[PDB]
């Protein structure tokens, strides 16, 4: 994103959160000092083989979005996540219109 | 620590004939002094290791070693002063007084003062070596 | 009130007040409940002298309490206790930030932690500090708590000026100023605020780094100095804003460095560091100090050499003043700054030292003549080490008086007005010796030297008062003999070259003075008329019992009032004056078989303050005089103990709801406990009974008052006052408590204590009693949830500090004091000074005193 | 002895000593701050070395630094002052400048944690090759020490088989040089690394619980020297830190109990002790208000210790000696807390009548406060100190702790007191005191031990 200098995926991969040390929706490990971008390539890659195109994106809007959701409920953590998980979206988003699958832009 | 012994129960003029220097370890007693009630003291008949000790002290004179293993000594000085200083009481030979001031100097007082390479001209002058 | 003094009737409500402001988070606040007798689990209780008289090591140990951090109570209280008293060094090495991660994030409420550790790192911090830990240390998600937004946004100043932004800077630390002055401040009716102090110091570090990133270059920065060095000659009294304000700077010219800023952040250092020395803190004050150490600073490292001169190493400090001064007279080396300082504390050293004859030191006073030659405070210390020199050659034989030492006091003489650096302040240093030779001359009416040089003095005396001793007090008690021919002289020129003289309304070896005096070029009015007048009034209306007319009601007299009303005083500020526009008159009528009394009416149209005394008190007046010290020793906390002055000039001369405070003591007269019955089981009836029975009476009740008087600026600001003069009643040995203790007026801050009428009057008094200061049974109560160990405790520790390392020189004032006519002791307790709490201290030495 | 007088040949031959004695042992603005640096009195010059340090800059300056809050045992502000756990890692694959490993890790090594040990032991490994002896010794034995976070003790020995060839190879020399006073790290770490790992006396599990009685015995072969010879507890507190599983490790801190009986220095007791009141152990948190007291102050430990004191009188209080030792601390802390006048310390001396007999150095202690308060008190023939010596004496026969050794203590006085009599004796009061001490220490003598 301008300015944000990375590759936003890297810029993920400096996202630890100490009091969240369980999550898991579609195999989602995330710990005390483990990196929202460490699951987050960990996602992308395995993702890649399993996953189609738009199953894909589906898999990381709602899998990144229960991210989304337990990161902000939790207040006492601070969302560092969801501004750069939310442009993760957006790439998704835009990747293609007919690739993107309306049932996914719903969720 | 036998002469702050000597002079804080309160002799003076310790007689160079009492003064005995045994070979094997180097201990300096006081045979009499004579010393219960400032005996001699306010009498004190005679008013009276140079840089011989500093060439054998070392290459750095009395730089460290000196006053450092004197100073863990000084820790050992200080924690037992009443100790010590009962075993002072052994110059009555015939005082209270001027041994409690002195041995508040043990712990630490200073003449006339309520405190309580540069170290080879200080720790030289160490008073706990050069007093007397 | 309604149930015993410990108990869980009592502790549960206290524990949860704890909890609640735990939340809020007032530091000191904080140090007075964890300490309040708190008898939980040993760590959590220990705070007892959490600060005062034993306080890094506590502190290490709340560090490594909260180092596994999962008490977040204990390390927010860790970080209390770092700031309490300023261990800022192991704020930022607490290694929850300073690390390759930091923050856990949103440190809730919890947020004393980041309000504690910001303030720290921002006195002591840089790029890397407040870059990366406030890029830590904001990132939160509850908005709940400010400190942190303030302190961030001091901190983002900081990072802006490294940046080299004048305009962001000055926009960052301006919006500190809306936040703090928004929600910070605190209102009126209280405004005994020293609470708030913290908080608007802050507020004026944040105003200093504003100018000085506004400051246009060297010149300018420089201007800059000095109007900082003008703040440090009238901002206030206390090392903890010392230590802020000039540390905030510190991180200033830090963090901003050039190489014109590099000799900026050395200078800085250099105050913060010998500022933080002279009010007794010798730790952090020394930490800074060797940070400018790494920077070419003699004399620097002759102060430290100084605070060892008080604690370990007399000799070596002696010795390295000695060899530096005399080879370090090449390049540099200002001889009348650097070499003048060095051998002058060399001087002042072995005065007090005398483990090598005074021989070389009167030689070192002439090498200072020599070196120093622009400077003068060596001049004025050999006036009074020649003072030490008259007393020495007094014990040498029948020579006390000198001439280099006069001619060190006609020069002093030739400069008196200029400045006033030291002149008010050390005038017991003078009238010690001349009232000393004073009693020389009526003694030996060998000593054939009282006459010329008495006469010197008298001389000397003369040409400062005629066109300026005004220091006379109990020495000067009365005036009603000649003998001397300079006594009544000066006590009554200076009442004409000091223009209160219009009210007053051995037998004959007083007149002929005063009919000299009359004869002198100078006569308004013959005063012996009206003092004889009101004494034949007195003397025939001292017996007519049963079982005031004829000099009353009369005034335009030629004396002053002999009520006590005449000497509110100035101090060094630099044209200095010995009482604003004011003409006593209204001789009082009252038959009061004396309160006659008047106010401030000066031009503007304010008042001014007003206290009654009598009878030839001036250990009240060496009270000011301390004041004054802190005041040169200032020159966060910030204790507000305000002051009047009861000088003289002659005999029986000089100086929360209360109204609340009134009734309330009435109250706790007027529940008809008997009056004067308790005083018959205190001393006529059993003693070690006695005991117990001041026990009855700290059960039976007074606290109740002063807590309904407080709230949170009330009792804050009062505890720190009792705390520093009553660590002051103390270290004087002063004690002997007074009926109206406090009486103060009500709108915005005066807070203080009054007695002090009494000087060593407990321990060198007839019958001695108990040696202490004012404290009462109950005066843990007095404080209430803090208990009289609490911010009392802490204020009593900068108590300490505030006047420990001019404690040689107080101790040396206090020397003179004295006076046994109406030594070992003395020296004692100054080498004291040198080196609950009613709960157990009121039953301890109050009742080994009186059981 | 061929020299001038003044020291004006020594300008070449100063600076070699200095280089010398930091091997051999035998131990301008920033050359007249080290005045104090060793006297007696450390904290001054100490934080003048941790400031000249924090500028992280000078490596002479920084080892003097850490080889000095060193000497007498920072070993937790050492591990605090650590460029390591920080922005970046240490002195990363530290080249020759790795002498503040050398000096750090045994900070941690006996004042640290699994946490601690080990994010010092990633740390520290570092290097290339393993050219490093000091902190590489150190290094064996965090390491050992992680090894017992994963808990096999076995494979813990081997890291103490590699420690110990490490030490014995590449750190002593013969005698004829040296005596072991300044051999004090070597030894001092020797002794630490058999109580790390070593299985022969101690090797059965009904040895060590009988263990825990016959470690009590360490300070015999080790010795008394604060230094690190003292070992009545405080390599107690190292045994069960050894042996932490559960159960034992709930008793690492219990074990640390009578500790911290041994600390002005006492940063380093803080940290240990702070660690260890994470246990509540009562007996650990009377040594906390003894370092605090140590310090130097009197009341604050008076009141925690009282008020503990006044407490356990059923809850935990070790019925061996806990409240016996808060006791102990008590004593000291009335007698140089100056408060505690005859009847306030016998209270506690009837106290100790009440609930323990075992351990009278306590009585002792009532006794030289008595000494301090008698003698500034008739500074003779005083009735009130003739009974006081009288129920001293009777507390002289039994629980002998110190009879023999402190009872010159009060006779010596008495005796004087005699002598005086005998050349001058109104002093017609010391008759009765005289006659009566007499008989109850002939009663005593009668009814005493024998040496």
Same mark, same amino acid.
């Given at each position: 994103?301008? *300015?944000?200098?990375?590759?936003?995926? &890297?810029?993920?991969?400096?996202?630890?959160?100490?009091?969240?040390?369980?999550?898991?929706?579609?195999?989602?490990?995330?710990?005390? *000092?483990?990196?929202? *971008?460490?699951?987050?390539?960990?996602?992308?890659?395995?993702?890649?083989?399993?996953?189609?195109?738009?199953?894909?994106?589906?898999?990381?809007?709602?899998?990144?979005?229960?991210?989304?959701? &337990?990161?902000?409920?939790?207040?006492?953590?601070?969302?560092?996540?969801?501004?750069?998980?939310?442009?993760?979206?957006?790439?998704?988003?835009?990747?293609?219109?007919?690739?993107?699958?309306?049932?996914?832009?719903?969720? | 620590?036998?002469?702050?012994?000597?002079?804080?129960?309160?002799?003076?003029?310790?007689?160079?004939?009492?003064?005995?220097?045994?070979?094997?370890?180097?201990?300096?007693?006081?045979?009499?002094?004579?010393?219960?009630?400032?005996?001699?003291?306010?009498?004190?008949?005679?008013?009276?290791?140079?840089?011989?000790?500093?060439?054998?002290?070392?290459?750095?004179?009395?730089?460290?070693?000196?006053?450092?293993?004197?100073?863990?000594?000084?820790?050992?000085?200080?924690?037992?002063?009443?100790?010590?200083?009962?075993?002072?009481?052994?110059?009555?030979?015939?005082?209270?007084?001027?041994?409690?001031?002195?041995?508040?100097?043990?712990?630490?007082?200073?003449?006339?003062?309520?405190?309580?390479?540069?170290?080879?001209?200080?720790?030289?002058?160490?008073?706990?070596?050069?007093?007397? | 009130?309604?149930?015993?003094?410990?108990?869980?009737?009592?502790?549960?409500?206290?524990?949860?007040?704890?909890?609640?402001?735990?939340?809020?988070?007032?530091?000191?606040?904080?140090?007075?409940?964890?300490?309040?007798?708190?008898?939980?689990?040993?760590?959590?209780?220990?705070?007892?002298?959490?600060?005062?008289?034993?306080?890094?090591?506590?502190?290490?140990?709340?560090?490594?309490?909260?180092?596994?951090?999962?008490?977040?109570?204990?390390?927010?209280?860790?970080?209390?206790?770092?700031?309490?008293?300023?261990?800022?060094?192991?704020?930022?090495?607490?290694?929850?930030?300073?690390?390759?991660?930091?923050?856990?994030?949103?440190?809730?409420?919890?947020?004393?932690?980041?309000?504690?550790?910001?303030?720290?790192?921002?006195?002591?911090?840089?790029?890397?500090?407040?870059?990366?830990?406030?890029?830590?240390?904001?990132?939160?998600?509850?908005?709940?708590?400010?400190?942190?937004?303030?302190?961030?946004?001091?901190?983002?100043? #900081?990072?802006?000026?490294?940046?080299?932004?004048?305009?962001?800077?000055?926009?960052?630390?301006? %919006?500190?100023?809306?936040?703090?002055?928004?929600?910070?401040?605190?209102?009126?009716?209280?405004?005994?605020?020293?609470?708030?102090?913290?908080?608007?110091?802050?507020?004026?570090?944040?105003?200093?780094?504003?100018?000085?990133?506004?400051?246009?270059?060297?010149?300018?920065?420089?201007?800059?100095?000095?109007?900082?060095?003008?703040?440090?000659?009238?901002?206030?009294?206390?090392?903890?804003?010392?230590?802020?304000?000039?540390?905030?700077?510190?991180?200033?010219?830090?963090?901003?460095? +050039?190489?014109?800023?590099?000799?900026?952040?050395?200078?800085?250092?250099?105050?913060?560091?010998?500022?933080?020395?002279? %009010?007794?803190?010798?730790?952090?004050?020394?930490?800074?100090?060797?940070?400018?150490?790494?920077?070419?600073?003699?004399?620097?490292?002759?102060?430290?050499?100084?605070?060892?001169?008080?604690?370990?190493?007399?000799?070596?400090?002696?010795?390295?003043?000695?060899?530096?001064?005399?080879?370090?007279?090449?390049?540099?080396?200002?001889?009348?700054?650097?070499?003048?300082?060095?051998?002058?504390?060399?001087?002042?050293?072995?005065?007090?030292?005398?483990?090598?004859?005074?021989?070389?030191?009167?030689?070192?006073?002439?090498?200072?003549?020599?070196?120093?030659?622009?400077?003068?405070?060596?001049?004025?210390?050999?006036?009074?080490?020649?003072?030490?020199?008259?007393?020495?050659?007094?014990?040498?034989?029948?020579?006390?008086?000198?001439?280099?030492?006069?001619?060190?006091?006609?020069?002093?003489?030739?400069?008196?007005?200029?400045?006033?650096?030291?002149?008010?302040?050390?005038?017991?240093?003078?009238?010690?010796?001349?009232?000393?030779?004073?009693?020389?001359?009526?003694?030996?009416?060998?000593?054939? $030297?009282?006459?010329?040089?008495?006469?010197?003095?008298?001389?000397?005396?003369?040409?400062?008062?005629?066109?300026?001793?005004?220091?006379?007090?109990?020495?000067?008690?009365?005036?009603?003999?000649?003998? =001397?021919?300079?006594?009544?002289?000066?006590?009554?020129?200076?009442?004409?070259?000091?223009?209160?003289?219009?009210?007053?309304?051995?037998?004959?070896?007083?007149?002929?003075?005063?009919?000299?005096?009359?004869?002198?070029?100078?006569?308004?009015?013959?005063?012996?008329?009206?003092?004889?007048?009101?004494?034949?009034?007195?003397?025939?209306?001292?017996?007519?019992?049963?079982?005031?007319?004829?000099?009353? %009601?009369?005034?335009?007299?030629?004396?002053?009032?002999?009520?006590?009303?005449?000497?509110?005083?100035?101090?060094?500020?630099?044209?200095?004056?010995?009482?604003?526009?004011?003409?006593?008159?209204?001789?009082?009528?009252?038959?009061?078989?004396?309160?006659?009394?008047?106010?401030?009416?000066?031009?503007?149209?304010?008042?001014?303050?007003? $206290?009654?005394?009598?009878?030839?008190?001036?250990?009240?007046?060496?009270?000011?005089?301390?004041?004054?010290?802190?005041?040169?020793?200032?020159?966060?906390?910030?204790?507000?103990?305000?002051?009047?002055?009861?000088?003289?000039?002659?005999?029986?001369?000089?100086?929360?709801?209360?109204?609340?405070?009134?009734?309330? /003591?009435?109250?706790?007269?007027?529940?008809?406990?008997?009056?004067?019955?308790?005083?018959?089981?205190?001393?006529?009836?059993?003693?070690?009974?006695?005991?117990?029975?001041? $026990?009855?009476?700290?059960?039976?009740?007074?606290?109740?008052?002063?807590?309904?008087?407080?709230?949170? +600026?009330?009792?804050?600001?009062?505890?720190?006052?009792?705390?520093?003069?009553?660590?002051?009643? =103390?270290? #004087?040995?002063?004690?002997?408590? =007074?009926?109206?203790?406090?009486?103060?007026?009500?709108?915005?801050?005066?807070?203080?204590?009054?007695?002090?009428?009494?000087?060593?009057?407990? /321990?060198?008094?007839?019958?001695?009693?108990?040696?202490?200061?004012?404290?009462?049974? %109950?005066?843990?109560?007095?404080?209430?949830?803090?208990?009289?160990?609490?911010?009392?405790?802490?204020?009593?520790?900068?108590?300490?500090?505030?006047?420990?390392?001019?404690?040689?020189?107080?101790?040396?004032?206090?020397?003179?004091?004295?006076?046994?006519?109406?030594?070992?002791?003395?020296?004692?307790?100054?080498?004291?000074?040198?080196?609950?709490?009613?709960?157990?201290?009121?039953?301890?030495?109050?009742?080994?005193?009186?059981? | 002895?061929?020299?001038?007088?003044?020291?004006?040949?020594?300008?070449?031959?100063?600076?070699?000593?200095?280089?010398?004695?930091?091997?051999?042992?035998?131990?301008?603005?920033?050359?007249?701050?080290?005045?104090?640096?060793?006297?007696?009195?450390?904290?001054?010059?100490?934080?003048?070395?941790?400031?000249?340090?924090?500028?992280?800059?000078?490596?002479?300056?920084?080892?003097?630094?850490?080889?000095?809050?060193?000497?007498?045992?920072?070993?937790?502000?050492?591990?605090?002052?650590?460029?390591?756990?920080?922005?970046?890692?240490?002195?990363?694959?530290?080249?020759?400048?790795?002498?503040?490993?050398?000096?750090?890790?045994?900070?941690?090594?006996?004042?640290?944690?699994?946490?601690?040990?080990?994010?010092?032991?990633?740390?520290?490994?570092?290097?290339?090759?393993?050219?490093?002896?000091?902190?590489?010794?150190?290094?064996?034995?965090?390491?050992?020490?992680?090894?017992?976070?994963?808990?096999?003790?076995?494979?813990?020995?081997?890291?103490?088989?590699?420690?110990?060839?490490?030490?014995?190879?590449?750190?002593?020399?013969?005698?004829?040089?040296?005596?072991?006073?300044?051999?004090?790290?070597?030894?001092?770490?020797?002794?630490?690394?058999?109580?790390?790992?070593?299985?022969?006396?101690?090797?059965?599990?009904?040895?060590?619980?009988?263990?825990?009685?016959?470690?009590?015995?360490?300070?015999?072969?080790?010795?008394?020297?604060?230094?690190?010879?003292?070992?009545?507890?405080?390599?107690?507190?190292?045994?069960?830190?050894?042996?932490?599983?559960?159960?034992?490790?709930?008793?690492?801190?219990?074990?640390?109990?009578?500790?911290?009986?041994?600390?002005?220095?006492?940063?380093?007791?803080?940290?240990?002790?702070?660690?260890?009141?994470?246990?509540?152990?009562?007996?650990?948190?009377?040594?906390?208000?003894?370092?605090?007291?140590?310090?130097?102050?009197?009341?604050?430990?008076?009141?925690?210790?009282?008020?503990?004191?006044?407490?356990?009188?059923?809850?935990?209080?070790?019925?061996?000696?806990?409240?016996?030792?808060?006791?102990?601390?008590?004593?000291?802390?009335?007698?140089?807390?100056?408060?505690?006048?005859?009847?306030?310390?016998?209270?506690?001396?009837?106290?100790?009548?009440?609930?323990?007999?075992?351990?009278?150095?306590?009585?002792?202690?009532?006794?030289?406060?008595?000494?301090?308060?008698?003698?500034?008190?008739?500074?003779?023939?005083?009735?009130?100190?003739?009974?006081?010596?009288?129920?001293?004496?009777?507390?002289?026969?039994?629980?002998?702790?110190?009879?023999?050794?402190?009872?010159?203590?009060?006779?010596?006085?008495?005796?004087?007191?005699?002598?005086?009599?005998?050349?001058?004796?109104?002093?017609?009061?010391?008759?009765?005191?005289?006659?009566?001490?007499?008989?109850?220490?002939?009663?005593?003598?009668?009814?005493?031990?024998?040496?």
């Amino acid at each position: 994103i301008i *300015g944000a200098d990375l590759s936003t995926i &890297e810029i993920l991969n400096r996202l630890k959160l100490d009091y969240i040390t369980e999550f898991k929706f579609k195999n989602f490990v995330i710990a005390k *000092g483990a990196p929202i *971008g460490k699951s987050i390539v960990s996602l992308l890659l395995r993702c890649k083989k399993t996953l189609t195109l738009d199953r894909f994106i589906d898999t990381l809007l709602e899998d990144i979005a229960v991210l989304i959701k &337990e990161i902000s409920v939790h207040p006492n953590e601070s969302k560092l996540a969801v501004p750069f998980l939310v442009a993760l979206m957006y790439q998704i988003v835009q990747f293609r219109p007919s690739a993107t699958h309306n049932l996914a832009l719903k969720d | 620590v036998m002469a702050m012994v000597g002079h804080i129960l309160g002799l003076g003029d310790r007689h160079c004939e009492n003064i005995l220097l045994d070979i094997q370890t180097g201990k300096v007693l006081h045979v009499d002094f004579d010393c219960l009630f400032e005996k001699g003291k306010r009498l004190p008949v005679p008013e009276i290791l140079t840089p011989n000790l500093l060439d054998a002290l070392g290459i750095i004179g009395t730089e460290g070693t000196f006053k450092k293993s004197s100073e863990v000594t000084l820790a050992l000085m200080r924690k037992n002063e009443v100790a010590l200083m009962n075993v002072i009481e052994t110059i009555m030979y015939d005082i209270q007084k001027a041994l409690k001031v002195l041995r508040n100097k043990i712990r630490g007082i200073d003449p006339q003062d309520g405190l309580v390479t540069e170290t080879l001209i200080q720790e030289a002058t160490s008073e706990d070596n050069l007093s007397k | 009130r309604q149930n015993p003094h410990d108990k869980n009737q009592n502790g549960q409500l206290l524990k949860n007040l704890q909890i609640t402001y735990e939340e809020i988070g007032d530091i000191d606040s904080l140090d007075g409940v964890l300490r309040t007798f708190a008898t939980g689990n040993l760590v959590s209780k220990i705070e007892e002298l959490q600060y005062s008289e034993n306080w890094k090591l506590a502190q290490d140990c709340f560090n490594v309490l909260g180092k596994f951090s999962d008490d977040p109570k204990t390390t927010t209280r860790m970080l209390k206790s770092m700031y309490d008293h300023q261990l800022y060094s192991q704020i930022i090495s607490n290694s929850s930030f300073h690390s390759s991660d930091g923050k856990i994030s949103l440190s809730p409420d919890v947020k004393e932690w980041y309000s504690i550790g910001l303030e720290a790192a921002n006195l002591e911090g840089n790029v890397q500090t407040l870059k990366n830990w406030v890029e830590q240390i904001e990132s939160l998600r509850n908005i709940d708590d400010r400190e942190v937004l303030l302190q961030y946004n001091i901190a983002k100043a #900081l990072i802006a000026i490294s940046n080299e932004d004048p305009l962001r800077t000055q926009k960052y630390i301006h %919006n500190s100023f809306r936040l703090i002055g928004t929600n910070f401040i605190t209102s009126s009716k209280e405004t005994t605020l020293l609470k708030k102090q913290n908080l608007l110091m802050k507020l004026h570090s944040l105003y200093d780094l504003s100018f000085l990133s506004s400051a246009k270059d060297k010149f300018e920065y420089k201007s800059n100095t000095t109007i900082l060095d003008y703040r440090m000659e009238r901002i206030g009294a206390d090392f903890v804003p010392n230590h802020y304000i000039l540390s905030m700077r510190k991180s200033f010219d830090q963090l901003k460095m +050039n190489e014109q800023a590099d000799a900026d952040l050395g200078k800085t250092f250099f105050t913060l560091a010998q500022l933080a020395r002279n %009010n007794a803190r010798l730790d952090i004050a020394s930490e800074s100090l060797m940070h400018c150490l790494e920077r070419r600073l003699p004399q620097a490292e002759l102060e430290f050499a100084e605070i060892l001169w008080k604690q370990g190493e007399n000799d070596r400090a002696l010795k390295i003043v000695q060899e530096i001064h005399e080879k370090y007279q090449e390049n540099s080396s200002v001889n009348a700054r650097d070499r003048a300082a060095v051998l002058l504390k060399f001087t002042e050293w072995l005065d007090l030292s005398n483990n090598s004859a005074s021989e070389q030191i009167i030689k070192q006073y002439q090498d200072i003549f020599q070196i120093d030659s622009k400077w003068d405070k060596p001049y004025y210390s050999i006036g009074l080490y020649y003072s030490r020199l008259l007393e020495r050659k007094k014990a040498e034989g029948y020579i006390t008086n000198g001439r280099f030492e006069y001619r060190a006091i006609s020069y002093f003489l030739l400069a008196f007005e200029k400045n006033t650096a030291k002149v008010r302040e050390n005038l017991p240093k003078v009238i010690t010796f001349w009232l000393d030779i004073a009693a020389a001359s009526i003694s030996e009416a060998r000593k054939e $030297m009282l006459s010329k040089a008495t006469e010197d003095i008298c001389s000397h005396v003369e040409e400062a008062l005629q066109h300026c001793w005004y220091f006379v007090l109990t020495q000067l008690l009365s005036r009603l003999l000649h003998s =001397h021919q300079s006594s009544a002289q000066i006590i009554m020129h200076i009442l004409l070259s000091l223009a209160y003289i219009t009210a007053l309304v051995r037998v004959l070896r007083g007149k002929h003075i005063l009919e000299k005096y009359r004869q002198h070029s100078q006569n308004p009015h013959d005063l012996v008329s009206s003092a004889l007048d009101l004494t034949k009034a007195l003397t025939r209306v001292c017996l007519q019992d049963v079982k005031f007319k004829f000099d009353m %009601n009369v005034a335009p007299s030629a004396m002053v009032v002999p009520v006590r009303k005449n000497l509110d005083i100035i101090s060094p500020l630099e044209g200095y004056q010995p009482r604003p526009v004011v003409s006593i008159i209204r001789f009082g009528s009252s038959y009061k078989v004396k309160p006659k009394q008047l106010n401030i009416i000066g031009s503007d149209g304010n008042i001014y303050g007003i $206290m009654c005394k009598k009878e030839d008190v001036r250990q009240d007046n060496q009270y000011m005089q301390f004041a004054t010290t802190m005041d040169f020793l200032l020159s966060k906390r910030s204790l507000g103990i305000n002051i009047y002055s009861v000088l003289s000039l002659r005999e029986d001369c000089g100086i929360v709801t209360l109204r609340s405070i009134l009734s309330t /003591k009435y109250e706790s007269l007027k529940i008809k406990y008997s009056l004067k019955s308790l005083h018959d089981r205190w001393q006529h009836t059993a003693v070690d009974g006695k005991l117990e029975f001041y $026990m009855e009476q700290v059960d039976k009740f007074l606290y109740q008052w002063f807590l309904e008087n407080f709230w949170f +600026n009330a009792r804050n600001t009062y505890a720190r006052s009792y705390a520093v003069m009553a660590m002051v009643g =103390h270290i #004087l040995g002063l004690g002997d408590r =007074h009926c109206e203790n406090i009486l103060l007026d009500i709108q915005t801050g005066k807070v203080l204590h009054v007695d002090f009428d009494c000087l060593f009057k407990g /321990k060198r008094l007839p019958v001695p009693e108990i040696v202490p200061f004012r404290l009462t049974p %109950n005066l843990l109560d007095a404080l209430g949830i803090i208990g009289t160990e609490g911010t009392f405790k802490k204020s009593s520790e900068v108590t300490l500090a505030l006047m420990r390392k001019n404690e040689v020189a107080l101790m040396n004032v206090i020397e003179t004091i004295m006076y046994d006519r109406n030594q070992k002791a003395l020296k004692v307790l100054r080498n004291k000074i040198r080196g609950l709490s009613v709960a157990g201290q009121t039953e301890t030495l109050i009742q080994e005193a009186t059981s | 002895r061929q020299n001038p007088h003044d020291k004006n040949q020594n300008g070449q031959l100063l600076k070699n000593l200095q280089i010398t004695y930091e091997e051999i042992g035998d131990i301008n603005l920033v050359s007249k701050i080290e005045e104090l640096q060793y006297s007696e009195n450390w904290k001054l010059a100490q934080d003048c070395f941790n400031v000249l340090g924090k500028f992280s800059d000078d490596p002479k300056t920084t080892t003097r630094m850490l080889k000095s809050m060193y000497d007498h045992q920072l070993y937790s502000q050492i591990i605090s002052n650590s460029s390591f756990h920080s922005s970046d890692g240490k002195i990363s694959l530290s080249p020759d400048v790795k002498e503040w490993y050398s000096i750090g890790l045994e900070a941690a090594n006996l004042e640290g944690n699994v946490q601690t040990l080990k994010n010092w032991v990633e740390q520290i490994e570092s290097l290339r090759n393993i050219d490093d002896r000091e902190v590489l010794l150190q290094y064996n034995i965090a390491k050992a020490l992680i090894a017992i976070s994963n808990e096999d003790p076995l494979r813990t020995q081997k890291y103490i088989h590699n420690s110990f060839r490490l030490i014995g190879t590449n750190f002593i020399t013969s005698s004829k040089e040296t005596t072991l006073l300044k051999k004090q790290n070597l030894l001092m770490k020797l002794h630490s690394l058999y109580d790390l790992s070593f299985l022969s006396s101690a090797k059965d599990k009904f040895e060590y619980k009988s263990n825990t009685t016959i470690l009590d015995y360490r300070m015999e072969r080790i010795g008394a020297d604060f230094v690190p010879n003292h070992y009545i507890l405080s390599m107690r507190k190292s045994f069960d830190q050894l042996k932490m599983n559960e159960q034992a490790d709930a008793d690492l801190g219990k074990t640390f109990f009578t500790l911290a009986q041994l600390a002005a220095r006492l940063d380093i007791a803080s940290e240990s002790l702070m660690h260890c009141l994470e246990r509540r152990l009562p007996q650990a948190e009377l040594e906390f208000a003894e370092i605090l007291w140590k310090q130097g102050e009197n009341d604050r430990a008076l009141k925690i210790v009282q008020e503990i004191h006044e407490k356990y009188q059923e809850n935990s209080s070790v019925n061996a000696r806990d409240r016996a030792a808060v006791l102990l601390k008590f004593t000291e802390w009335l007698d140089l807390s100056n408060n505690s006048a005859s009847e306030q310390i016998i209270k506690q001396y009837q106290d100790i009548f009440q609930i323990d007999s075992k351990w009278d150095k306590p009585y002792y202690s009532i006794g030289l406060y008595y000494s301090r308060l008698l003698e500034r008190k008739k500074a003779t023939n005083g009735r009130f100190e003739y009974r006081a010596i009288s129920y001293f004496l009777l507390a002289f026969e039994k629980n002998t702790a110190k009879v023999r050794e402190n009872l010159p203590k009060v006779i010596t006085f008495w005796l004087d007191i005699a002598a005086a009599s005998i050349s001058e004796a109104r002093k017609e009061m010391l008759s009765k005191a005289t006659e009566d001490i007499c008989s109850h220490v002939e009663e005593a003598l009668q009814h005493c031990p024998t040496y």
